[PDB]
Amino acid sequence: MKAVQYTEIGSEPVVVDIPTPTPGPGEILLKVTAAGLCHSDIFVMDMPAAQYAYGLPLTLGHEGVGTVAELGEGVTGFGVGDAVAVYGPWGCGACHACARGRENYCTRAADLGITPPGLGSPGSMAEYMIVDSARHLVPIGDLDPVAAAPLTDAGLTPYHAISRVLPLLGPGSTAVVIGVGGLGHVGIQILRAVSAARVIAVDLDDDRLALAREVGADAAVKSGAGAADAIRELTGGQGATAVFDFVGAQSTIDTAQQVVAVDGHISVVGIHAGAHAKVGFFMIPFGASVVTPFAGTRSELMEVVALARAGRLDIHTETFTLDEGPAAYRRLREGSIRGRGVVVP
Amino acid sequence: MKAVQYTEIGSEPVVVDIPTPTPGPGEILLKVTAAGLCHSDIFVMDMPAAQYAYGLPLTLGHEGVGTVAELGEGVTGFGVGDAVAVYGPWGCGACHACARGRENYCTRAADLGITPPGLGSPGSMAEYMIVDSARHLVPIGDLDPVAAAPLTDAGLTPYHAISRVLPLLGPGSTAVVIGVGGLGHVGIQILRAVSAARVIAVDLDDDRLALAREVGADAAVKSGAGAADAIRELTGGQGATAVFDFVGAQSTIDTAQQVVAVDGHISVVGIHAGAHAKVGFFMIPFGASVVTPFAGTRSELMEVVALARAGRLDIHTETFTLDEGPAAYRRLREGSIRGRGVVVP
Amino acid sequence: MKAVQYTEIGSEPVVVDIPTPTPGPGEILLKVTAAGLCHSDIFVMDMPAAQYAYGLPLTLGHEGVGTVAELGEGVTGFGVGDAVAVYGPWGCGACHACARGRENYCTRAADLGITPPGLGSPGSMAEYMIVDSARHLVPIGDLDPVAAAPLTDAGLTPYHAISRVLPLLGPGSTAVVIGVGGLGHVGIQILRAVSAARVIAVDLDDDRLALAREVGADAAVKSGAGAADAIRELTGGQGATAVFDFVGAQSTIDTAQQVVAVDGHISVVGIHAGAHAKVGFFMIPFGASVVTPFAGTRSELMEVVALARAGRLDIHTETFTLDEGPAAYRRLREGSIRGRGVVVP
Amino acid sequence: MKAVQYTEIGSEPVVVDIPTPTPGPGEILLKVTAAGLCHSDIFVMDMPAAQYAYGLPLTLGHEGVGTVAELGEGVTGFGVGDAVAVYGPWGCGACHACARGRENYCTRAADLGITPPGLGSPGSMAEYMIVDSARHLVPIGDLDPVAAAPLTDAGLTPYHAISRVLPLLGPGSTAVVIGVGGLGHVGIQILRAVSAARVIAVDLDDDRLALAREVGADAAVKSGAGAADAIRELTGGQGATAVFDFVGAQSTIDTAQQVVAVDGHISVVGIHAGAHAKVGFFMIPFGASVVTPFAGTRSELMEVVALARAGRLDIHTETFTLDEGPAAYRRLREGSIRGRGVVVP
Ligand SMILES: NC(=O)c1ccc[n+]([C@@H]2O[C@H](COP(=O)([O-])OP(=O)(O)OC[C@H]3O[C@@H](n4cnc5c(N)ncnc54)[C@H](O)[C@@H]3O)[C@@H](O)[C@H]2O)c1
Ligand SMILES: NC(=O)c1ccc[n+]([C@@H]2O[C@H](COP(=O)([O-])OP(=O)(O)OC[C@H]3O[C@@H](n4cnc5c(N)ncnc54)[C@H](O)[C@@H]3O)[C@@H](O)[C@H]2O)c1
Ligand SMILES: NC(=O)c1ccc[n+]([C@@H]2O[C@H](COP(=O)([O-])OP(=O)(O)OC[C@H]3O[C@@H](n4cnc5c(N)ncnc54)[C@H](O)[C@@H]3O)[C@@H](O)[C@H]2O)c1
Ligand SMILES: NC(=O)c1ccc[n+]([C@@H]2O[C@H](COP(=O)([O-])OP(=O)(O)OC[C@H]3O[C@@H](n4cnc5c(N)ncnc54)[C@H](O)[C@@H]3O)[C@@H](O)[C@H]2O)c1
Ligand SMILES: [Zn+2]
Ligand SMILES: [Zn+2]
Ligand SMILES: [Zn+2]
Ligand SMILES: [Zn+2]
Ligand SMILES: [Zn+2]
Ligand SMILES: [Zn+2]
Ligand SMILES: [Zn+2]
Ligand SMILES: [Zn+2]
């Protein structure tokens, strides 16, 4: 089968021909219908040799949808041909966190050598992929695979970050979304569907502010030095109830601390090495909590899929072949994909 | 192997010799160390022939603990010899409820023909038992098996019922426990461990009021017509924040409605055919919710086990052999077991 | 001043001329701009003489909005001319419930002789009214008074009932609304604004099903014997996550019990003497809670007003003069007001 | 009357003779029975002249209990002689936060010139004090005033910090308490009363580790570089579910980040200028939230009082006269008071 792999340290990924795998007991083989491109795949390829420990070769792609091709021994609950999304952050399945479906916060996965697809285990950028367990598949019915692949991380991650503080986002609340890309443009639409919060979007690029307005933001403001004062002019001086930072650079976190309300929330979702919120007295308002969330829970992926099936999420994508995989990663590095890149085998 | 089975409709259970089973893919064989006796086994044996559909024969026992004897193909996460409790209310493992570990509220188990051990699938009253999946086992370490078997239902069910309204039970709150038997005497101890609620126990029998005080109730009162006024004398006339009725007879539910506070809770846990709360205006205080909960979640069983391991639960038991199984069920019918009956093979 | 009063037992209310009151210390005098008509005013007038204890005469109207006319001694936080809604369910202000703004569940108001406006204290169906305390006023800014008066009960009561179980109403959930009148037509719009639940409306009258669709219900079905099966055909057989019954007749509660999902909720909001849910095993699904809520909290009234100011609530009203008050109550008895009746002085 | 006042910038507080005040409309005069000494009074006296804006003179003491001496015009709900604790963080009483009793997070108090007693308004270190409003008094019944004064901040602040994440602290959880002084020794006892968490105390001083064990900590460990690993040896490697840092120095926050579990919580309660948590990827575990809470809510003070009345809180105090006030502040600066200092007029 054709696959896109990271083969040596520092080099760009290449297209290869490798064996189609076979499912052992409890496993499921999927024929891949769509694989998302995210910055997690870039992060893995930008590690120095001394820090890298995901193995070589590594099939990329941690966002994946497909159809069930073959069932391993003892697997029931799915038939051949069933369309399914892959739950990405694989946990042990047995700890207190995993027992509530919160495998994203599994306290044992590191020690057991359980790694997610595309980040240690083979990913979705191939004609076929193995899924370790039935509990990591979610049915998608007749949802278009191209629009569904982004739901497994571009949808799941913002959905989770929002869900952690949903009781704060009542009528009269304000939510700020910083960064209107793959994650951010889906986050705006989740906020509108599951809350009555007023939504203010922030980005560097005028074209991304246009995208923000297209997907339902109430206002959109230019990022940088003027952003904090512009956000406060919109909120009448009270501050934003919640800030969802999908950039996570030091300057965007600083903006978040300058606009968050007393008893509010900052969610640092975007990943920039070294950047951090400074949570201490006189540096942040009283009662304003801060967290770096990771991925999402099993039930949250099901809820994101239910939003898509009800017509509440317009996912903006650009489609690539497997041969175009390397080129699509270059496009992702330069920030020229409007929404989520998706590879179709 | 020796086992206690229901073999014909209307007759008492008998001791039999049947095949020791073999675990298929995904399954685990346990050597049973302790099996609890509950009223669910009685309910099953008291069904008329036209209503019964659990199959004959049926190995009894839906409360169970054991040691892992054999792993079926593909099972990891457990080694041979590991001491484990069985999670009883088996769900499909795939629906929204099951994805949060709430298999007690699985919306699909009926349609798929998934039945709990002792209530359609073979139970724990035997030398060995099959468990369908690794996710239905919880490690217990060096906990005494006899004191651990009751935790799987006598512990789990009250823990769940309490957990549904735990935020109501702050300092200054009052919780009433009606019925101090297998479930009720564990429920009192859970309330004391996980809340600052004042606990008032209610029973017909002076010996059970003594048990209530032994396990930490702040007061204990006689059941019947005078119970409502006696409870109100203890609460200064304000009413009880929550009432956990582990009897569920019409007279105890009536008492619960007469004592519950405004914005309080009644949990109807005990099962008496035909009995029901009457929830309407002028029949119950404003904002007082009522529910019939069932069993508990996976994470809740783990929490109950953590309470036992920390020394917070003194489980009162009487021990029987497998040969004494039929006799022990007669003892349970007449209400002469002080706490939970447990069979040890 | 002109006012509409209940003057003798069994008779219809009459228009009268009475003294304009003066505010004592802590009190505020409002010039009334709009007063809602609800069934609470009917209930008060339909009491037998032996049960009635609200005093005679009694100025009707427990839904009220106005402008601050005069401040009593020591009152700050409002200026003359400020537009305000009246928080209806007056509590003691000092107990545990009142300290969280939950004055609807005040445990002391009965014993202290604190009565709501229109139900023991003089109501809003007059040119002026006294409000006891500053904490019972909520600013409405430039909101149209006619559309704002219904918010104080037709808005507040459904908002509260929904808020009690909002975490259940995620994407993929279904909420059933029974009765599309004053409360029900606002309840549909609250569900759409603060959740992603699919909304199914139920009523006897085809004209009210039309109203339901106008205000955003996803489906609307005829009430009565066929309603349960019709609701289950729409939910694919799974049942409704929550049922909000704004009728509360025995037949509608029965329908609610036949459609509610496992681990769901029934809110009995409508008031029909004698009617009640029957909460017991085999009469309702496992884990399905039932409650009769009353009115709402202070913070909830503020949130309802914030929804109105954001344009999320289209309140259907018919306007009457004070002279037309008696006639408007006859219209309310026969069910010929489409939405909420409102009196404008 | 005698009082302890800050009279000029940079100087120590002095004992003075000033007028006994009279209560205006809505106000209550208390005869003070006990006044706590906290670091908030130190912070106020250590401000440079250009930053100080609380006025001179300033009567110190923001922890206070007393008996009602005189009622201002229009005040009901209290009789002369009633024993009461003062709710410290005075809010406007009208905003969304204040309507839920969360006056600690009032968004409007600054703009309205409402200041707490001892921090802008006259405090409790005097024979008498004015309280602005009846809603800022909580009845204490026959509680010893000396043990009750600390409850208003040493009790309230930890109770609030704990309450924000109480659902995380189930059986099997671990809570770390850093700093066993006024706040910390009460925080340990709250954790034991309202949760089943294992409690690990941390301090620099062996005498304070002894105090931790006296008030019910399950273990006590020396602070500094080895504290992290010592806490992990006690938790079997999993990390602490929640860390309550009542010191808030950079070294204790660093310790907190090294021990907190995935999906856990750090509460930075102690105040050290410049110190802060660093919340960013690779510096803190996934999902671990951080906050600086302030004081507590009205309902939380009531709950703390209910804990004291049930015998769940042993408050360690040292008693001083008003003449000893200045000396007692010197003792507080050098850290030589074992628990909470309390002044008795
Ligand atoms: N926490 C998690 O589990 C998780 C999961 C997935 C992705 N991520 C991270 O989220 C981030 C976003 O991912 P994506 O796929 O949506 O990225 P993307 O490239 O699709 O979009 C980036 C967007 O951010 C904007 N942007 C860049 N710098 C900005 C600034 N200073 N101010 C405002 N806007 C700015 C860009 O204009 C663009 O609109 C990445 O850092 C990624 O690593 C985190
Ligand atoms: N909802 C669930 O998931 C669930 C799970 C397990 C058991 N149950 C049910 O819980 C109930 C109790 O189970 P158990 O094993 O504790 O029973 P048990 O026989 O061990 O205990 C019964 C106790 O209730 C007391 N009692 C009986 N009638 C009473 C009355 N009118 N007033 C006060 N006290 C009275 C008895 O003296 C005894 O102490 C049963 O009805 C059982 O079927 C429900
Ligand atoms: N719990 C509370 O705090 C509270 C507060 C306010 C009102 N209420 C009660 O709520 C109820 C509704 O109040 P409202 O002012 O909206 O009434 P309304 O007269 O404005 O509307 C009643 C609606 O119910 C419909 N209806 C009647 N019988 C029905 C049936 N069997 N099935 C389906 N639909 C039916 C009617 O067609 C009508 O549209 C009243 O009983 C009132 O007393 C309760
Ligand atoms: N956030 C709030 O609302 C709030 C409210 C009240 C007090 N506070 C603050 O809380 C802190 C504690 O107040 P308190 O009155 O209990 O103080 P305290 O002086 O009574 O207690 C200090 C305790 O901390 C210990 N300690 C000091 N430095 C330490 C270190 N580096 N490592 C470990 N332990 C150390 C001491 O040995 C002592 O046990 C202060 O900073 C105070 O300003 C905050
Ligand atoms: Zn990603
Ligand atoms: Zn795990
Ligand atoms: Zn049972
Ligand atoms: Zn299921
Ligand atoms: Zn009404
Ligand atoms: Zn009250
Ligand atoms: Zn303090
Ligand atoms: Zn306020």
Q: What share of chain B is helix, strand, coil (3-state, %, to 5)?
A: 30, 25, 45
Residue C245 Cβ inside 6 Å of ligand 3? The answer reads no
Ligand nearest to the CA of C161: 3
Q: Where are the beta strands (DSSP E) in chain C?
A: 2-6, 14-17, 28-36, 58-59, 63-71, 83-86, 128-131, 137-139, 174-178, 198-203, 219-222, 240-245, 260-268, 277-279, 289-291, 317-320, 340-343
Task: Retrieve residue C11's tokens.
Answer: 């008779």
Q: Which amino acid is at B336?
A: S
**Residue of A40, A157, A180, A246 to mutate, ligand 1, most atoms within 8 A of C-beta:** A246
Cα-based angle D298, D303, D308 (whole degrees, multiple of 5): 130
Same domain, C140 and C170: no
Please give the full DSSP string across B113-176, using - where no structure is assigned. Answer: T---BTTTB--SSBSEEEES-GGGEEE-TT--HHHHGGGGTTTHHHHHHHHTTGGG--TT-EEE
Question: CA-nearest residue of chain B to A87?
Answer: B99
Specify whether the CB–CB gap between B189 and B313 falls below 8 A.
yes
Residue D87, token pair as written in the block: 């709710």
Spatial distance between the Cα atoms of C95 and A291, rounded to a whole number of angstroms: 35
Per DSSP, D165 falls in state T
CA D332 to chain centre: 15
Residues of D in contact with C106 (CB under 8 A): none
The Cα–Cα gap between A301 and A307 comes to 10
Nearest residue CA, atom 28 of ligand 3? Answer: C247
CA-to-CA distance for A59 and A231, rounded, in angstroms? 42
Could you give the count of Cα atoms lying within 13 Å of B175 in the half-sphere of its Cβ?
A: 31
Tell whether the torsion through CA atoms of B213, B216, B218 and B224 is positive or negative.
Answer: negative
Cα dihedral sign, C37-C40-C43-C45: negative
Contacts of C279 in chain B (CB under 8 A): 268, 276-279, 290-292
Cα–Cα distances in Å, from C36 out to A281, C146, C158?
48, 9, 16
Strand partners, A249: none
Which candidate, A112, A70, A6, A13, places its Cα nearest to that of A326?
A13
User: Is C297 within 8 Å of C274 (Cβ atoms)?
Assistant: no
Residues of B in contact with C286 (CB under 8 A): 104-105, 292-294
| In contact, B320 and B341? CB cutoff 8 Å | yes
**CA distance, residue D181 to nearest chain A CA (Å):** 20
d(CA B261, CA B250): 19
B123 CA → ligand 2 middle, Å = 21
Count helices and strands (H / E) in chain D: 11, 17
Tell how far the Cα of C211 is from the centroid of ligand 8, in angstroms: 37
Q: Give the residue from chain D lying closest to C132, CA to CA.
A: D74
Distance, in Å, from the CA atom of B178 to the CA atom of D281, rounded to the nearest integer, reads 50
Q: Which residues of chain B have a CB within 8 Å of the CB of A26? A: 25-26, 74
DSSP string, D301-318: HHHHHHHHHTT-----EE
Instruction: Please identify which residue in the block is written with the tokens 């793959």.
Output: A182
Any residues with CB less than 8 A from the CB of D47 and at least 6 apart, and which? Answer: D9
Q: How far is CA D269 from the centre of its chain?
A: 9
The Cα–Cα gap between C302 and B78 comes to 54
State how far the Cα of B272 lies from the Cα of B281, in Å rounded to an integer: 24
Count Cβ atoms below 10 Å from residue A143 Cβ, excluding itself.
17
At residue D87's C-alpha, the angle toward residues D85 and D91, to 5°, is 160
Contact between residue C192 and residue C218 where contact means Cβ atoms under 8 Å apart: no
Instruction: Give the Cα-Cα-Cα angle D160, A289, C160 (nearest 5 degrees).
Output: 70
Q: Mark out the alpha helices in chain B (DSSP H runs).
A: 39-45, 96-99, 109-112, 145-148, 156-163, 182-194, 206-214, 227-234, 250-259, 298-309, 325-333
Ligand 4 in reach of D223 Cβ (< 6 A)? yes
| Interface mutation vs chain B, best among D143, D298, D303, D312, most B CBs within 10 Å | D303
What the block records as the tokens of A67 is 């159809």
Q: Is C266 in the pocket of ligand 3 (CB under 6 A)?
A: no
| Distance separating alpha carbons of residues D221 and D205, to the nearest angstrom | 10
The sign of the CA dihedral B26, B29, B34, B35 is: positive
Q: Cα distance from B307 to chain D (closest Cα, Å)? A: 6
Distance B101 CA to ligand 8 centre (A): 9
What type of residue sits at position B216?
G
- Max alpha carbon distance in chain C (Å)? 62
For the CA of D238, the nearest ligand: 6
| C-beta of C104 in contact with ligand 3 (< 6 A) | no
DSSP assignment of C92-156 equals -SSSHHHHTT-GGG-SSHHHHT---BTTTB--SSBSEEEES-GGGEEE-TT--HHHHGGGGTTTH
SS3 D112: helix
Write phi, then psi, for B5 (nearest 5 degrees). -130, 150
**Rounded Cα gap, residues C319 and C146, in angstroms:** 8
Strands D128-131 and D28-36: antiparallel
The CA angle A321-A327-A330, to the nearest 5 degrees, is 140
Greatest alpha-carbon pair distance for chain B in Å reads: 61
The reply to whether omega before A25 is within 30° of 0 (cis) is no
Nearest Cα residue to A129 out of A9, A30, A28: A30
d(C-alpha B148, C-alpha B156), whole Å:
11
Query: How far is the centre of ligand 7, averaged over its atoms, from the C-alpha of B45 (Å)?
Result: 13
CA atoms lying within 13 Å on the CB side of residue D101:
26
Q: Could you say which DSSP state residue B316 is in? A: -
φ, ψ (nearest 5 deg) of residue D168: -70, -25
A340 near A150, Cβ under 8 Å? yes
Give dist(CA D181, CA D295) in Å, integer.
Answer: 16
Q: For residue D324, how many C-alpha atoms fall within 13 Å in the half-sphere facing its CB?
A: 15
Q: Are C167 and C242 in contact (CB under 8 A)?
A: no
A–D CB contacts, 8 A cutoff, strictly below: 111
Q: How far is CA D223 from CA A24, C186, D209, D228, D276, in A?
A: 50, 57, 10, 9, 18
Closest CA to C125 of C41, C7, C24: C41
Q: Are residues A153 and A167 in the same domain?
A: no
Structure tokens at B178: 């009606």
Same domain assignment for residues A80 and A175: no
| CA distance, residue A214 to nearest chain C CA (Å) | 19
Helix axes B156-163, B182-194, angle to 10 degrees: 50
The owner of tokens 């930008």 is A46
* Phi/psi of residue D33, nearest 5 degrees: -105, -25
Six-digit token string for C52: 């009635």
Q: What are phi and psi of D107, to 5 degrees?
A: -90, -5
Cα separations in angstroms, A99 against A93, C141, D48, D115, D288: 6, 49, 54, 48, 19
Residue D4: helix, strand or coil by DSSP? strand
Sequence-distant (≥ 6) Cβ neighbours of residue C110 within 8 angstroms: none
Q: Which residue of B has its CA nearest to A26?
A: B74
Q: Which of C279, C286, C294 should one mutate to test binding to chain B, selecting the residue with the greatest count of B CBs within 10 A? A: C279
**Chain-chain contact of C105 with B294 (C-beta, under 8 angstroms):** no
- Backbone angles phi and psi of C266, in degrees to 5: -120, 125
Residue from B211, B271, B331, B332 whose mutation best tests the ligand 2 pocket (most atoms within 8 A of CB): B271
Closest atom of ligand 4 to D337 CA is 20
| A311 and A290 inside one domain | no
Tell me the three state secondary structure of residue D13: coil
Orientation angle between helical segments C182-194 and C156-163, nearest 10 degrees:
50
Which of B266, B294, B322 is the endpoint of a domain?
B294
- With a CB cutoff of 8 Å and minimum separation 6, the contacts of A125 are A3, A4, A32, A35, A59, A60, A61, A118, A322, A325, A343
Q: Which domain holds residue B251?
A: 158-294
Mutate to test the pocket of ligand 3, among C204, C244, C268 (most ligand atoms within 8 A of CB): C204
Q: Are residues B338 and B323 in the same domain?
A: yes
CA distance D33 to D56: 25
Q: Which residue, D237, D178, B238, A174, is CA-closest to C105?
A: B238
Contact A170, C301 (CB under 8 A): no
- Helix C250-259 and helix C227-234, axial crossing angle in degrees, nearest 10: 30
Residues B103 and B46 sit within 8 Å (Cβ to Cβ): no
Domain co-membership, A179 together with A320: no
CB crowding A154-186: b at 16 or more within 10 Å, else e: bbbbbbbbbbbbbebbbbbbbbbbbbbbbbbbb
- Three-state DSSP class for C258? helix
Token readout for C341 is 């009746």
- CATH number of residue C125's parent domain: 3.90.180.10
Closest CA to D219 of D180, D269, D165, D270: D180
Q: Are both A259 and A336 inside the same structural domain?
A: no
CB contact under 8 A, A290 and D294: no
Q: Tell me if D188 CB under 6 Å of ligand 4.
A: no
- What is the resolution in angstroms? 2.2
d(CA B109, CA B219): 41
Backbone torsions φ then ψ of C146, nearest 5 degrees:
-60, -45
Residue C199: strand pairing partners: C175
Measure CB to CB from residue A99 to each of B72, B92, B101 and give the nearest one: B101
The helix, strand and coil proportions of chain C, stated in percent and rounded to the nearest 5, come to 30, 25, 45
How many Cβ atoms from other residues are within 10 Å of residue A94's Cβ? 21
Q: Please report, for the domain that includes residue D213, its CATH number.
A: 3.40.50.720
- For chain C, the residue count is 345
Burial class for D312, CB neighbours closer than 10 Å (0-12, 13-18, 19+):
middle
10 Å CB burial of residue A79 (0-12, 13-18, 19+) is exposed
Verify that C166 and C153 share a domain, yes or no: no
User: Between A72, A74, A101, which is nearest B99 by CB?
Assistant: A101
Q: What is the largest CA-CA distance in chain D?
A: 61
Neighbouring residues of B24: CB distance < 8 A, sequence distance ≥ 6 = A74, B72, B73
- What is the C-alpha separation between D302 and D156, in angstroms, rounded? 9
Beta strands A317-320; A340-343: pairing state: parallel
Instruction: Say yes or no: D87 and D30 in one domain.
Output: yes
Chain D neighbors of C82, CB-CB under 8 A: none
Q: Diameter of chain A by CA atoms?
A: 61
Which residues of chain A make contact with D253, given a CB cutoff of 8 A?
280
Q: Are residues B174 and B121 part of one domain?
A: no
Q: Which two tokens stand for residue A63?
A: 């966002």
Helix boundaries (H) for chain A: 39-45, 96-99, 109-112, 145-148, 156-163, 182-194, 206-214, 227-234, 250-259, 298-309, 325-333
CB of D181 shorter than 6 A to ligand 4: yes
- Please indicate, yes or no, whether residues A198 and A323 belong to a single structural domain of this protein: no
Query: Are B98 and B106 contacting, i.e. CB atoms less than 8 angstroms apart?
Result: yes
| Identity of residue C40 | S
User: Within 13 A of B221's CA, how many CA atoms are on the CB side?
Assistant: 22
* CB spacing of A291 vs D287 below 8 angstroms: yes
**For C198, nearest residue in chain A (alpha carbons):** A310
The two three-digit tokens of residue C94, written as one number: 């000092």
Cα angle A83, A89, A90 (rounded to 5 degrees) comes to 85
Helix C182-194 and helix C206-214, axial crossing angle in degrees, nearest 10: 30
Task: Compute the half-sphere exposure of residue D241: CA atoms within 13 Å on the CB side of its CA.
Answer: 21
H helix or E strand, kind and range, residue B2: strand B2-6
CA dist., res. C218 & res. C200, Å (int): 6
Last residue of a domain, one of C278, C294, C310: C294
Task: For residue C186, report the distance from its CA to the centre of ligand 10, in Å.
Answer: 28
In whole angstroms, give the CA distance from residue A221 to residue A203: 7
Q: Does D24 touch chain C (CB under 8 A)?
A: yes
The two three-digit tokens of residue B284, written as one number? 């119950």
Please name which of A107, A155, A103 lies closest in space to residue A302, comparing C-alpha atoms.
Answer: A155
In eight-state DSSP terms, residue B50 is T
Which is nearest to B178 in space by CA: B93, B270, B262, B108?
Answer: B270
Ligand 4 in contact with D335 (CB < 6 A)? yes
Q: Which residue has the tokens 């309902």?
A: D299
Please indicate, yes or no, whether residues B243 and B321 belong to a single structural domain of this protein: no
**Under the phi-then-psi rule, with left for phi > 0, alpha for psi from -120 to 50, and beta for the rest, what region is D156?**
alpha
D310–B198 CB contact, under 8 Å: yes
Q: Which residues contact A61 (CB under 8 A, 6 or more apart)?
A: A4, A35, A36, A37, A41, A117, A118, A123, A124, A125, A126, A129, A343
Give the number of domains in chain D. Answer: 2
Contact A302, B100 (CB under 8 A): no
Residue C279 amino acid letter:
V
